[PDB]
Amino acid sequence: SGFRKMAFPSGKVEGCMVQVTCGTTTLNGLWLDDVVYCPRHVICTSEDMLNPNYEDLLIRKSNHNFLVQAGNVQLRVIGHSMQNCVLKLKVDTANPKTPKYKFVRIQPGQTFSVLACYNGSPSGVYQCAMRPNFTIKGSFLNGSCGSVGFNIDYDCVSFCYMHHMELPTGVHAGTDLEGNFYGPFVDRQTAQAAGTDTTITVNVLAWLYAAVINGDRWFLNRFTTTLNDFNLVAMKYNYEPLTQDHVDILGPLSAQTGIAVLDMCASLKELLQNGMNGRTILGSALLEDEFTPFDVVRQCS
Amino acid sequence: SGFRKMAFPSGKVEGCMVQVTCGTTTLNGLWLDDVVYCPRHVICTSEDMLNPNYEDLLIRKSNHNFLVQAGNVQLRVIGHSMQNCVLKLKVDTANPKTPKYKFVRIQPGQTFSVLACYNGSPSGVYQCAMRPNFTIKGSFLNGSCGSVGFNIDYDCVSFCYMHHMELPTGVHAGTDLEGNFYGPFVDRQTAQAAGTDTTITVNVLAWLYAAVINGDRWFLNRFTTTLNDFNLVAMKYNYEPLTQDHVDILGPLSAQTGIAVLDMCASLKELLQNGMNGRTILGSALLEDEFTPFDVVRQCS
Ligand SMILES: C#CCNC(=O)C[C@H](Cc1ccc(F)cc1)NC(=O)[C@@H](Cc1ccc(Cl)cc1Cl)NC(=O)[C@H](N)Cc1ccccc1C#N
Ligand SMILES: C#CCNC(=O)C[C@H](Cc1ccc(F)cc1)NC(=O)[C@@H](Cc1ccc(Cl)cc1Cl)NC(=O)[C@H](N)Cc1ccccc1C#N
Ligand SMILES: [Ca+2]
Ligand SMILES: [Ca+2]
Ligand code: NA
């Protein structure tokens, strides 16, 4: 029993993290087989960063401009290329610790684990959700750029995120491992804003089910609502509308607890309209929305 | 910027986790050099578990009763002994992935990372505090016994916890790696209760400093209180009394923010007496007490 913010074990990713240096810019890279992946803005000076033309800047680079370090052992760069916003540096050594992996782009509301790194050295691991406005609320300091987010699925690492930047509001933006940004952001040092965020409704419901599984029941009630009538309360509290597709993935938690999804929605409706009145659910005093139905099942079953 | 529940990278510990089987009992063990550490109650049957005499039960065991598996490769047990509540199984192979390590017992209010494992296979990582009543509020299912908690300090793993049991209230109890229980618990399948818990005051203050560092300031005020006068409000809200020793370790965060500790205590006093009035601090709607001053500095500096 118990319910915690839980990350995947990070070791398979720790063995892939390297330090990539270009000029006086140093960030993290991801070493899989004989290719190192890192944010392309490593090739930028502080002056280049204000308004870079990356095709120009890369064309003016050669392999010997890129210092790669796996621990202390320097890696020799034998080629380089650009994949949208990520730089690919070919090296003369395949990473012997390369796990089975995939590059997958995730959806808003899905979660992943972040291995925060500095100078190619892993420092901490935590869980994140991709917000509906395509930012993540991470924990990142200078030098973390190049850190990756991932899920693990039967010894296969699915890389879904590489960290590129902190926005002025302190939230974080990056790309998938094909270098395609999440959200309407670009890799240049200009003040960019995210769209307005919303609460991930399906995840809050998943977490209410986790609470019931763990014996928290005070928020339950005998009522029910319709899928249509609930969405009217979602709009008012800046929650995502609920889909029959969402209900069906909540199916398993609905079965294990005996609480129909629309029954739980009436509980969420009451929680939204009345607040918690000082009580907690799974040790929290607000409605948590960064646990997916999968996260809940993985931890409660 | 940002502030997250953050664990240590788990890879150094993942390479030490094995499966230990005795009879029909299977749990996790920790393989360092040529010794495997696991909870001694692995030698118990379900009938033995109600009221075990462990010296008897171990004396009736031999090496070939203990099946150890590191992945698929079985480890041959060449000796066994008891260290209080942990069983030591000597094996014929030193773990090639053995990190630099120490066995350290922690204090109530300190934090560590938990690598939750099942059948010797790591499944998730999260952060825990040792509660003042010597339990932890973990996330653990059947088969997790033997999972370890740890901190990492310059490539040295300090093991401080091995998981032995879930109490009837759903909180978790275990030992240090010398097999000495945290708190007034024993390893037998009987209903045991923890003492009444209290809030870790120094940690709440650390977290208020983290919030200020991250730009959350609404709870601040111009007031101040005395060390003595604050403890009177601590007693009323079931908070630990504050020590000058606590203040001095909060020194660095007090300096970096310019907020004297007793100034922050007046803010905590007001938060305790008035509540949050619907507002959040670092994304939480209650006062978090599972971040130490060290945790805050590590993540904010
Ligand atoms: C709350 C608050 C205040 N917020 C900040 O002070 C962070 C500021 C915000 C900003 C954004 C744009 C701008 F015009 C001016 C300021 N942004 C950074 O400093 C970015 C600058 C940057 C570098 C490259 C590209 Cl492609 C894109 C960008 Cl926008 N630097 C990093 O993100 C680093 N690599 C990693 C890093 C450094 C320092 C602090 C955090 C992190 C992280 N994580
Ligand atoms: C909320 C709620 C309900 N709470 C429970 O149902 C857990 C129950 C509580 C209990 C405690 C004592 C008792 F008389 C009767 C019941 N306790 C377990 O089941 C313990 C039994 C046990 C095994 C050995 C020793 Cl030395 C000590 C103990 Cl008390 N089993 C584990 O802890 C397993 N290894 C790991 C495990 C199994 C199942 C569920 C969680 C976990 C964990 N983590
Ligand atoms: Ca209901
Ligand atoms: Ca004050
Ligand atoms: Na974590």
Among A151, A142, A299, A150, smallest CA distance to A213 is for A299
Structure determination method: X-ray
DSSP assignment of A98-116: PPEEEE-PPPTT-EEEEEE
**Please, where in chain A does CATH 1.10.1840.10 lie?**
198-301
Q: Which helix (H) or strand (E) holds A121?
A: strand A121-129
- Note the CATH architecture for domain A15-99: Beta Barrel (2.40)
A126 CA to centre of ligand 5 in angstroms: 4
Contact present, A62 and A81 (Cβ < 8 Å)? no
User: Which ligand is in closest contact with the Cα of A259?
Assistant: 3
Q: Which two tokens stand for residue A201?
A: 């409704």
**DSSP 8-state assignment for residue A182:** S
Q: Where in chain B is the domain with CATH 2.40.10.10?
A: 1-14+100-197, 15-99
Closest-approach residue (CA) in chain A for B122: A9
Which atom of ligand 2 lies nearest, measured to the CA of B27? 34
**Both tokens assigned to A112:** 């992943």
Q: What HEC string does A210-273 produce?
A: HHHHCCCCCCCCCCCCCHHHHHHHHHHCCECCCCHHHHHHCHHHHHHHCCCHHHHHHHHHHHHH
**Phi then psi for A113, rounded to 5 degrees?**
-100, 145
Closest-CA residue in chain A for B151?
A: A124
> Which of 1.10.3720.10, 3.30.465.10, 1.10.1840.10, 1.10.287.3610 is the CATH number of A198-301?
1.10.1840.10
Which of the following CATH numbers is that of domain A1-14+100-197: 3.40.50.720, 2.40.10.10, 1.10.2020.10, 3.40.50.20? 2.40.10.10
* Residue A162 backbone zone (phi > 0: left; psi -120 to 50: alpha; other: beta): beta
Q: What is the distance in A from the centroid of ligand 1 to the CA of A167? A: 6
Nearest by CB to B124, from A8, A214, A276: name it. A8
CA–CA min distance A65, chain B (Å): 30
In this complex, the residue of B9, B128, B166 whose CB is nearest that of residue A10 is B9
CA of B140 to the centre of ligand 2 (A): 10
* Nearest-angstrom CA–CA distance, B183 and B196: 12
Token pair listed for A217: 């029941």
For this entry, resolution in Å reads: 1.9
Of B22, B38, B41, B160, the catalytic one is: B41
Among A112, A147, A130, A111, residue whose Cα is nearest residue A37: A147
> Token pair for residue B43?
């030698």
HEC string of chain B? CCCCCCECCCHHHHCCEEEEEECCEEEEEEEECCEEEEEHHHHCCCCHHHCCCHHHHHHCCCHHHEEEEECCEEECEEEEEEECCEEEEEECCCCCCCCEEEECCCCCCCEEEEEEEECCEEEEEEEEECCCCCCECCCCCCCCCCCEEEEEECCEEEEEEEEEEECCCCCEEEECCCCCECCCCCCCCCCCCCCCCCECHHHHHHHHHHHHHCCCCCCCCCCCCCHHHHHHHHHHCCECCCCHHHHHHCHHHHHHHCCCHHHHHHHHHHHHHHCCCCCCECCECCCCCCCCHHHHHHHHC
